[PDB]
Amino acid sequence: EQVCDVFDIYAICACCKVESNEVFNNYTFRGLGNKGVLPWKCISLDMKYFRAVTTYVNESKYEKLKYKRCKYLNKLQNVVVMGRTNWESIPKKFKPLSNRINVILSRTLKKEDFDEDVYIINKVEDLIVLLGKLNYYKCFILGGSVVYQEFLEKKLIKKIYFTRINSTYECDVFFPEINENEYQIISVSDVYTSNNTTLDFIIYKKTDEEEDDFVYFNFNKKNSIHPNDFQIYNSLKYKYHPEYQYLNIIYDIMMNGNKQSDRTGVGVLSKFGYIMKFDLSQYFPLLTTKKLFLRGIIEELLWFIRGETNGNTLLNKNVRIWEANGTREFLDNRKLFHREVNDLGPIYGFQWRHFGAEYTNMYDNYENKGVDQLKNIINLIKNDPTSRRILLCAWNVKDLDQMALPPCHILCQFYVFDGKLSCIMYQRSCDLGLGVPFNIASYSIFTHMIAQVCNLQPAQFIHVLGNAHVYNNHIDSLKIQLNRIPYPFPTLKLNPDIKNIEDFTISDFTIQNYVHHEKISMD
Amino acid sequence: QVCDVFDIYAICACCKVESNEVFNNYTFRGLGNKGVLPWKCISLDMKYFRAVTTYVNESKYEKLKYKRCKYLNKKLQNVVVMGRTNWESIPKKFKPLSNRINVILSRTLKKDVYIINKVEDLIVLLGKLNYYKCFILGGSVVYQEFLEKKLIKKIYFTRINSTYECDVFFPEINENEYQIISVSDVYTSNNTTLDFIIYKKTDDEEEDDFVYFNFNKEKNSIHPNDFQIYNSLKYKYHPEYQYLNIIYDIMMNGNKQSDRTGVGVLSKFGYIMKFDLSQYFPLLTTKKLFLRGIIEELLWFIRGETNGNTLLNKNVRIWEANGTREFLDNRKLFHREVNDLGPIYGFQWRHFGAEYTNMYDNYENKGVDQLKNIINLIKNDPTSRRILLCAWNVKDLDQMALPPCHILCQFYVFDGKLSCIMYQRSCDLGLGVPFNIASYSIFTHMIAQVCNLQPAQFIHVLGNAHVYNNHIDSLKIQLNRIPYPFPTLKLNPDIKNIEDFTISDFTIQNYVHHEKISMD
Ligand SMILES: NC(=O)C1=CN([C@@H]2O[C@H](COP(=O)(O)OP(=O)(O)OC[C@H]3O[C@@H](n4cnc5c(N)ncnc54)[C@H](OP(=O)(O)O)[C@@H]3O)[C@@H](O)[C@H]2O)C=CC1
Ligand SMILES: NC(=O)C1=CN([C@@H]2O[C@H](COP(=O)(O)OP(=O)(O)OC[C@H]3O[C@@H](n4cnc5c(N)ncnc54)[C@H](OP(=O)(O)O)[C@@H]3O)[C@@H](O)[C@H]2O)C=CC1
Ligand SMILES: CCc1nc(N)nc(N)c1OCCCOc1ccc(-c2ccc(C(=O)O)cc2)cc1
Ligand SMILES: CCc1nc(N)nc(N)c1OCCCOc1ccc(-c2ccc(C(=O)O)cc2)cc1
Numbered sequence A: 001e002q003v004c005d006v007f008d009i010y011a012i013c014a015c016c017k018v019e020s021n022e023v024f025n026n027y028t029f030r031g032l033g034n035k036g037v038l039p040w041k042c043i044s045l046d047m048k049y050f051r052a053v054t055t056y057v058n059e060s061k062y063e064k065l066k067y068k069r070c071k072y073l074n075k076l077q078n079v080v081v082m083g084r085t086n087w088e089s090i091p092k093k094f095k096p097l098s099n100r101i102n103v104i105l106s107r108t109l110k111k112e113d114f115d116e117d118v119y120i121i122n123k124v125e126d127l128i129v130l131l132g133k134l135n136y137y138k139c140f141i142l143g144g145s146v147v148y149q150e151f152l153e154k155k156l157i158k159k160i161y162f163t164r165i166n167s168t169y170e171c172d173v174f175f176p177e178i179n180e181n182e183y184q185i186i187s188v189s190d191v192y193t194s195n196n197t198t199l200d201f202i203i204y205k206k207t208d209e210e211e212d213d214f215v216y217f218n219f220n221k222k223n224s225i226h227p228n229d230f231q232i233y234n235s236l237k238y239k240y241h242p243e244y245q246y247l248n249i250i251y252d253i254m255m256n257g258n259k260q261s262d263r264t265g266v267g268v269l270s271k272f273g274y275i276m277k278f279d280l281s282q283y284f285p286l287l288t289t290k291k292l293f294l295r296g297i298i299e300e301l302l303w304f305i306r307g308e309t310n311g312n313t314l315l316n317k318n319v320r321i322w323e324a325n326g327t328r329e330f331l332d333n334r335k336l337f338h339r340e341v342n343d344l345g346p347i348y349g350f351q352w353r354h355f356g357a358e359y360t361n362m363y364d365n366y367e368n369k370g371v372d373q374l375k376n377i378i379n380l381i382k383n384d385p386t387s388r389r390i391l392l393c394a395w396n397v398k399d400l401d402q403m404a405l406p407p408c409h410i411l412c413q414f415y416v417f418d419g420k421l422s423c424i425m426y427q428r429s430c431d432l433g434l435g436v437p438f439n440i441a442s443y444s445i446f447t448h449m450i451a452q453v454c455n456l457q458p459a460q461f462i463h464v465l466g467n468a469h470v471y472n473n474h475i476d477s478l479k480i481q482l483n484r485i486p487y488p489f490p491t492l493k494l495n496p497d498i499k500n501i502e503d504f505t506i507s508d509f510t511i512q513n514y515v516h517h518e519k520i521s522m523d
Numbered sequence B: 001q002v003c004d005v006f007d008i009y010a011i012c013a014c015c016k017v018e019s020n021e022v023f024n025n026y027t028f029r030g031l032g033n034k035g036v037l038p039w040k041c042i043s044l045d046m047k048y049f050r051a052v053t054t055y056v057n058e059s060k061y062e063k064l065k066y067k068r069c070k071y072l073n074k075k076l077q078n079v080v081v082m083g084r085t086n087w088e089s090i091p092k093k094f095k096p097l098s099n100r101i102n103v104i105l106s107r108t109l110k111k112d113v114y115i116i117n118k119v120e121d122l123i124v125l126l127g128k129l130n131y132y133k134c135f136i137l138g139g140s141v142v143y144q145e146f147l148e149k150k151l152i153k154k155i156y157f158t159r160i161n162s163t164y165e166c167d168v169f170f171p172e173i174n175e176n177e178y179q180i181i182s183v184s185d186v187y188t189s190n191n192t193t194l195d196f197i198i199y200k201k202t203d204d205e206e207e208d209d210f211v212y213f214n215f216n217k218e219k220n221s222i223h224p225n226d227f228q229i230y231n232s233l234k235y236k237y238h239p240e241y242q243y244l245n246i247i248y249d250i251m252m253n254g255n256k257q258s259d260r261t262g263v264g265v266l267s268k269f270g271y272i273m274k275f276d277l278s279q280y281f282p283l284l285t286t287k288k289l290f291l292r293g294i295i296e297e298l299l300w301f302i303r304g305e306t307n308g309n310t311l312l313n314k315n316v317r318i319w320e321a322n323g324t325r326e327f328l329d330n331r332k333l334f335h336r337e338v339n340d341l342g343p344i345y346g347f348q349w350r351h352f353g354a355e356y357t358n359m360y361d362n363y364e365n366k367g368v369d370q371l372k373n374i375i376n377l378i379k380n381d382p383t384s385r386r387i388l389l390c391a392w393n394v395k396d397l398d399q400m401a402l403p404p405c406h407i408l409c410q411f412y413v414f415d416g417k418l419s420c421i422m423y424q425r426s427c428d429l430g431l432g433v434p435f436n437i438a439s440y441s442i443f444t445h446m447i448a449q450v451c452n453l454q455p456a457q458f459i460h461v462l463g464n465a466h467v468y469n470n471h472i473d474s475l476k477i478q479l480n481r482i483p484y485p486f487p488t489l490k491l492n493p494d495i496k497n498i499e500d501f502t503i504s505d506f507t508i509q510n511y512v513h514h515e516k517i518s519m520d
């Protein structure tokens, strides 16, 4: 038996990023303190997390623990152990830590130096002796760095409850580099915002009549993917990070997808009908299991809003997303023989500002032709917010054959409650490997832009997938990415002075604290 | 009590019996005909039966033997008690029931396979044996006496949703004595739908981690005891629970928001339901629905018609209020004729982009006949991801009596099977959504049959999803009813083109429903 399993010795900590195309890894989050105190101002959500974890006890589990500890030697409360510097960093009004047995490591200080109800120990060996004497549920080590360092060395930590604070601060002490061979992550929380920073919470691990009725009801339960190839992914117990909506859908298509061929001849695994929900109040859902850029997708969004159908505008900003859909060859295969190269026809922008107008060419002045659906939906959100008709539709059935291609992004519906704006986007055809990471980004940004110019706060972006597919040529790359653990998402900042939907320029957009795995050629 | 000690359960299978009509649990009361099962063999029940009555977990046995012994003042398998008729009705290749300890109650039979002469001599035999649980397999006599003498802990009741000729019945089950704890998925086997219900007599390192991850989880003007029955179920796998869970969720967490009429709703945003059309026809059973009107509307759509009068003369009144002089004047359609709803569903599916004149004009070959198009795609290019049928014509909205609630259908074809997604921008959960599920379910079948495919899944995506405040008391009654197995839909198989269906070509079979609820 290990000492730490007998006595249930855990560590808990919160690490931020520290100062300097960078590389990220687990060691990115390592900043513990600065000049005796915490690097940040009080982040509330971490404090509530730390108290809940350090105060929680289950009495009906004590019995088996009392036995286990008895066996090894022959209201219930947890124990918390702090280094002396750590103890001094805590405000007086929080001392001793409430509903917990406070223990302090020190040489320079003795029991006579403290007014408070606390145990003083001068060595770690004496902590084990004390734990041996006391009635307690679990034992949490609270730092600081020197304390952490020596409890990791001595192999005394069964699990690390680790908060990733997704900001940079000035630091002077640091959590030890964890060894992947000693400890591996088994669990990852939802992402949250608190005090103007995103954060998440991860757990590192050291390396009943009605039950039968369940089995009964399951009496009636393909693709050559080796489960082993998802070792890390399948090892995780709690996959609550919202990036798992995407990754889990990939997994589901790999294991249960249907083999079909598409135009190209590649073939896909396909399924039909999924929903993802992302909370933009708490994070910007830019994937972290691989590197993604946003310059292009913002430039496309702005080109849409201006009503444009001219491919050259994008090419001249060196955005190439629509290049291949504009070649002589592509247009000719679409039978658009009388269409100039890079004239993509009555696509997104045109439908958003001019639905129902007769498309001529990409240079025409279509002012006051068609329905300016973008304007109308901005008006509805402002003046008729409970309308269930706030919908913006790119799929104009009449003009489909005159488009370079039909829209994948069929419609956005909007929802307003309590000064907050949510968005449903319905996607008829979803390339999971390449297209969807970008598409989540695009409509998440657009939710912010619409939200802001209508004086609402963004709430939820909801992505409804119809035909959802993984290309075969993407499978190996997705296998890799599925075995990566997401980092906390970044945030998106918009210039607040931009008060009309048409007045945004690329420099009005900032992505902050993007932490991500390495870039991936899906091919 | 004895049945707790010795874990004596019943397991049975009951069909409907040949005689408005009323339905309740008693409807499912038929066990046998002429010493044989009333049905020709139903496989899923056989596989359920077997798997229920052979399943054992050896890790749980200590407790059982412990209790048993304390009470008697003292390769694991189950016990299976049969009546004599029961035992003989079984063909020989199935006797003795493999892998189970076979007991026969008889007053005439003569003694591995035990014989018992009266009931009390089971409890003796149980006190002597090692076994997991004890299953009473019938027949009627056995059930009766085991039941009247409180010797049954749970009933595993297979509800066979079809009518057969029967001479012997299951006892009535007293809703004071027993109540349903669980209901399974619905399935199709041997040309019948069926479900399984359960009557009940009336590393924890990761366990802490779950609590921690819940440290932030915290409107309800509704009450617990309001949903006693709903909340006291353990397994709710009946697909009717897709609808009802959504209502529950709106009633619990919905946003208070007021609509144009000043009625008030609770609304939420973004739901999916999925119904397997291969196994059933999802016509809500926790209340009565009628289908003639909604089929006629579907036929009106396909003909491409915009004339409210066509429906009104067949007494379908779905669109009546949207066609009044008042309702169009308010829509600023002063130059539109009463019951001329303008360029709605029909017009958009058959003439999208045509200039709408009036409901009597001749539109042949005007606009895009997208229904023809999607049907051609299904037939000739089934892997296209462009098979959508869109009613949301941004150009025509203002000229419609009202914008479509059913924005679009997307189709998908794999291995000779068709699935359909319908996206609905606005979902009146109490009144509209039940009819809407039926409507797009039938259409899915209609499209599939005319393209030589089998229907697979209907998938229903709710946008703005809401419950009217005057519906709440009725949805309360409705949540505490327990679904029955769904019916099936039959289309006249002769019909091979989407435009050749008539009202007579649709038959609902075996619709077992609770009593109609007046939504107000
Ligand atoms: N972000 C987070 O999650 C946390 C941050 N912190 C931060 O960390 C910093 C404090 O960490 P750090 O500087 O490493 O100081 P520590 O809190 O690790 O304290 C070290 C001191 O504790 C005593 N001590 C440690 N180990 C032993 C031992 N084996 N036997 C006897 N006495 C021992 C000694 O006290 P003495 O000198 O009196 O002999 C020693 O100098 C602060 O900036 C604090 O805010 C702290 C905890 C958690
Ligand atoms: N769908 C379902 O769930 C099931 C249906 N069935 C069907 O049920 C029918 C059989 O039911 P049923 O006709 O009632 O016949 P049973 O199977 O109930 O047989 C009854 C006989 O069992 C013996 N017995 C019953 N009670 C006692 C007692 N207290 N003490 C001693 N012996 C007793 C007697 O045989 P004796 O003459 O020896 O005294 C009695 O006549 C068949 O049609 C069969 O196919 C069969 C299994 C379950
Ligand atoms: C950061 C907490 C934390 N979280 C995780 N996840 N793990 C840990 N080991 C951990 O530290 C625990 C030991 C230190 O405890 C402190 C420290 C500071 C305060 C404080 C309160 C108010 C102000 C203010 O408002 O000025 C400032 C500081 C309260 C408790
Ligand atoms: C119906 C099963 C069942 N289910 C539930 N849920 N509860 C029960 N109590 C229960 O039956 C109890 C005794 C089962 O006994 C059998 C076994 C086999 C056959 C049989 C008949 C015809 C063929 C054929 O024609 O091939 C094959 C097999 C008939 C009766």
Ligand SMILES: O=c1ccn([C@H]2C[C@H](O)[C@@H](COP(=O)(O)O)O2)c(=O)[nH]1
Residues within 6 Å of the ligand: A405, A406, A408, A409, A429, A430, A431, A434, A435, A436, A439, B385, B386
């Ligand atoms: O904005 C877009 C455009 C295209 N695609 C992908 C999905 C398909 O793999 C392909 C287009 O499919 P169809 O046009 O055949 O549906 O491009 C996207 O994911 N997003």
Ligand SMILES: O=c1ccn([C@H]2C[C@H](O)[C@@H](COP(=O)(O)O)O2)c(=O)[nH]1
Residues within 6 Å of the ligand: A388, A389, B402, B403, B405, B426, B427, B428, B432, B433, B436
């Ligand atoms: O087939 C139909 C027709 C109407 N509605 C309901 C949804 C809304 O309660 C209302 C439509 O009103 P607006 O959403 O257009 O305001 O009618 C349905 O659910 N199904």
